[PDB]
């Protein structure tokens, strides 16, 4: 029926830890088109983080985050993923879940967002 | 044969439409992450059709280069071959460029009439091309040539 | 080898209903002419307004225009309406990485 | 009117053949190092070098009357603009193999058919050079 | 801001008159679809097969074909000639320092 | 009838200085960009630089930047290479490229020529 992406993967963490975030979708085949990660640094604007392909073989990686996160997908839940490793001060933001249109790099629907904060204190 | 062309055309036609709906959902920019790509005579014939659509002018100029590079025209009796051929844009006739210009038809007719009809409409909408390919000695002209194979 | 970086303009406006405004979303490089535009409002999801600088997704009003040559781009709400207050982010989509930019509230004065 | 059509092809086709040639050496990829007209129909040259919603119960009529309609003679944008491409491969190729560039020699070529087999005046009658971007 | 790296695969590969055979080509990095494939042959000079991933270069035969979406291309020798037997590179065209792939050695089997 | 042949090749010690050169005919020199690709023994294939047709705008790969200088004179038909302060990662074998039109892949090739760079 209607679109929804729904992410839970949230928290606050220390640094040089890891954390995986989950993304729930609904309202369309999963398995039919590519989606992608959106984060709001409260400095750095926008970044568009990592995109991965339908079936999961293909994914993108910004360079601040190469090495370092990893996108996947379980097209049978319906749900894809952003694995977390070596956290950095400069990776606390707000992380949006992000459905390509088509075979397009503009996106159809948003998540509401989920909070990841690193810091160990202050 | 006229026979035979008249059912070739079913292959040529489906995979006519399958390659010409794939690039009407193409990229607009640059593309999202794909996975790896990893076929009989009639239906090649499809996939080569698949391009062009709207800009037939394409093929007709590829077309052009191919037939100043066949007859070679000159400056002598080219008054006389030069508007024969733009004579050949506006005369009543059959070409090749209007036989793709056909088939691209039958994709607007079968993919239009499936969002606004009641069922799927792939397979009554070859019975539209076969009936009025075989009529308009469609078949006949692309027989007399050798066969979609062209 | 660098990344393209998108300088919106201005970051805050503050317009009323019937009035026009508009916003300018420039890149460092050439994008060609793909470049997206988002609407987020704060208690509903983000919606997406344009794509390809010009071109109006399924479901925007038609006061809404974008007009963009390759580094220069604009997009312009002609009657402004209150239905049309939130803040707007352009994204240009003509290589990777994807980049967006610093976004512009549309404020009611 | 028949003689707005008509000189505006000079326009119109000289700024086709110029970005006609434009885009058939341009950058396929990314461009080699390189070394370093707003009319109306200045543009129009450029913008081509570049509605019943059928129903059901009484498809079929419209169907073969319109599939007919390709392969008749008549006057359509599309064949138009071939005209005008046809044109290009004119100027380019003949200039290629002859003696002279031969623009000016091949726009009246091209005004004189148009005029003569009434597709100025089809131009004319759906506004002028200006309707062919709708 | 890192050069795109093109792997080759298989390194060595042995075929006979008729067969059919392909060579995969990855990137590091989006290059769309500008890849070209080239033929080298220890005698005679280095030619140009396709250009931007599936474009047929002026004189290459209708047996050559090549498909390729962002980050991985395919060549393919559908009906393998005697001629045929080579080494064959792939080199990115979408963005400078241009990157060629390490080879594909064609012999006879 | 197109034919590229490079010839400034050589046995030289590293740190020291060397000039490539390529001749071409069966085509107008004065309207095409030219290029240099080089085979490394290990490092594969390596586009090094190339330079517009008027020579005005030259490009290089960042490990040959300020040390390779690519130089053209189109009266004589004729690119050059200059590779100054050689190291032993440019000893390769360099090939003359020609650039298809405004794109970056190319028509035809040189034949090739040997550069060889070692401490004795």
């Known amino acids: 029926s209607e679109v929804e992406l729904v992410e839970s993967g949230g928290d606050l963490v220390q640094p040089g830890r890891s954390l995986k975030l989950s993304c729930?979708?609904?309202?369309?085949?999963?398995?039919?088109?590519?989606?992608?990660?959106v984060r709001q640094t409260p400095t750095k604007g926008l970044e568009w983080?990592?995109?991965?392909?339908?079936?999961?073989?293909?994914?993108?990686?910004?360079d601040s985050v190469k090495g370092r996160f990893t996108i996947s997908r379980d097209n049978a839940r319906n749900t894809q993923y952003l694995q977390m490793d070596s956290l950095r001060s400069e990776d606390t933001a707000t992380?949006?879940?992000?459905?390509?249109?088509?075979?397009?790099?503009?996106?159809?629907?948003?998540?509401?967002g989920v909070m990841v904060t690193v810091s160990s204190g202050s | 044969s006229e026979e035979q062309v008249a059912q070739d055309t079913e292959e040529v036609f489906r995979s006519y439409v399958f390659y010409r709906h794939q690039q009407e959902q193409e990229a607009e920019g640059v593309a999202a992450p794909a996975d790896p790509e990893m076929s009989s005579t009639m239906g090649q014939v499809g996939r080569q059709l698949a391009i062009i659509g709207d800009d037939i002018n394409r093929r007709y100029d590829s077309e052009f280069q191919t037939m100043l590079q066949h007859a070679q025209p000159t400056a002598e009796n080219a008054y006389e071959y030069f508007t024969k051929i733009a004579t050949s844009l506006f005369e009543s006739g059959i070409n090749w460029g209007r036989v793709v210009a056909l088939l691209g038809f039958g994709y607007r007719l079968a993919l239009h009439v499936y969002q606004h009809g009641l069922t799927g409409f792939l397979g009554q909408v070859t019975r539209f091309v076969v009936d009025f390919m075989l009529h308009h000695s469609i078949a006949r002209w692309i027989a007399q040539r050798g066969g979609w194979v062209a | 080898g660098s990344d393209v970086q998108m300088t919106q303009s201005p970051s805050y406006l503050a317009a009323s209903p019937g009035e026009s405004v508009s916003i300018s979303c420039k890149a460092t490089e050439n994008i060609n002419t793909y470049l997206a535009w988002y609407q987020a409002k704060p208690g509903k999801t983000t919606k997406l307004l344009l794509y390809s600088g010009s071109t109006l997704q399924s479901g925007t009003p038609s006061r809404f225009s974008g007009s963009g040559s390759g580094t220069d781009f604009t997009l312009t709400i002609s009657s402004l309406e209150p239905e049309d207050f939130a803040v707007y982010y352009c994204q240009q989509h003509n290589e990777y990485p994807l980049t967006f930019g610093s976004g512009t509230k549309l404020e009611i004065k | 009117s028949e003689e707005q059509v008509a000189q505006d092809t000079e326009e119109v086709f000289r700024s086709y053949v110029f970005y006609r040639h434009q885009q058939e050496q341009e950058a396929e990829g990314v461009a080699a190092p390189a070394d370093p007209p707003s009319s109306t129909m200045g543009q129009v040259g450029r913008q081509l070098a570049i509605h019943a919603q059928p129903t059901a119960e009484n498809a079929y009529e419209y169907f073969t009357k319109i599939a007919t309609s390709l392969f008749e003679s008549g006057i359509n944008w599309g064949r138009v603009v071939a005209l005008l491409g046809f044109g290009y491969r004119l100027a380019l190729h003949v200039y290629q193999h002859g003696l002279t560039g031969f623009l000016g020699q091949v726009t009246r070529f091209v005004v004189d058919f148009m005029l003569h087999h009434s597709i100025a005046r089809w131009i004319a009658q759906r506004g002028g050079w200006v309707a062919a971007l709708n | 801001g890192s050069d795109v790296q093109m792997t080759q695969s298989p390194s060595y590969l042995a075929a006979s008159p008729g067969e059919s055979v392909s060579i995969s080509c990855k990137a590091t990095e989006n290059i769309n679809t500008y890849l070209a494939w080239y033929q080298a042959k220890p005698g005679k000079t280095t030619k140009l097969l396709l250009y931007s991933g599936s474009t047929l270069q002026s004189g290459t035969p209708s047996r050559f074909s090549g498909s390729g979406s962002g980050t991985d291309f395919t060549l393919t020798i559908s009906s393998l000639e005697p001629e045929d037997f080579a080494v064959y590179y792939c080199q990115q065209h979408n963005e400078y320092p241009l990157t060629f792939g390490s080879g594909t050695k064609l012999e006879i089997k | 009838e197109v034919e590229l042949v490079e010839s400034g090749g050589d046995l030289v010690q590293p740190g020291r200085s060397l000039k490539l050169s390529c001749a071409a005919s069966?085509?107008?020199?004065?309207?095409?960009?030219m290029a240099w690709v080089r085979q490394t023994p290990t490092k594969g294939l390596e586009w090094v630089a190339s330079?517009?047709?008027?020579?005005?705008?030259?490009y290089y790969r960042d490990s040959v930047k300020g040390r390779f200088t690519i130089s053209r004179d189109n009266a004589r038909n004729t690119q050059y290479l200059q590779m100054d302060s050689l190291r032993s990662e440019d000893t390769a074998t360099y090939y003359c490229?020609?650039?298809?039109?405004?794109?970056?892949?190319?028509?035809?090739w040189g034949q090739g020529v040997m550069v060889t760079v070692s401490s004795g």
């Open positions: 069966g085509f107008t020199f004065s309207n095409l960009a």
């Open positions: 490229a020609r650039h298809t039109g405004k794109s970056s892949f190319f028509d035809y």
């Open positions: 330079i517009s047709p008027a020579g005005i705008t030259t």
